Design a protein around this ligand. Structure first.
Ligand code: SF4
Length: 83
């Protein structure tokens, strides 16, 4: 059960970025974002995930202010966590 502030499928930004809460049900292969092979990409290893926001598998994403994403999700803004 997703948190009350989870990013949802008719969120305009979620559509535009092709977010899914489950990276295995994402188009990460098609986008081929750089820095890791696409099958290795998910929110937990993304620069925009906020480790200090949320709880458990439901963490912040800088791009989705006021909400939570799933650590096992993905969107087309995926960028390697570099620091
Ligand atoms: S920007 Fe990164 S952390 Fe935020 S939803 Fe997309 S992949 Fe997940």
């Amino acid at each position: 059960a997703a948190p009350a502030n989870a990013v949802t499928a008719d969120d305009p930004t979620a559509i535009a970025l092709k977010y899914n809460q489950d990276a295995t049900k994402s188009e990460r292969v098609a986008a081929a974002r750089p820095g890791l092979p696409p099958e290795e990409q998910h929110c937990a290893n993304c620069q925009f995930m906020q480790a200090n926001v949320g709880e458990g598998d439901w963490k912040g994403c800088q791009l989705f202010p006021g909400k939570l994403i799933n650590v096992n999700g993905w969107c087309a803004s995926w960028t390697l966590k570099a620091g």
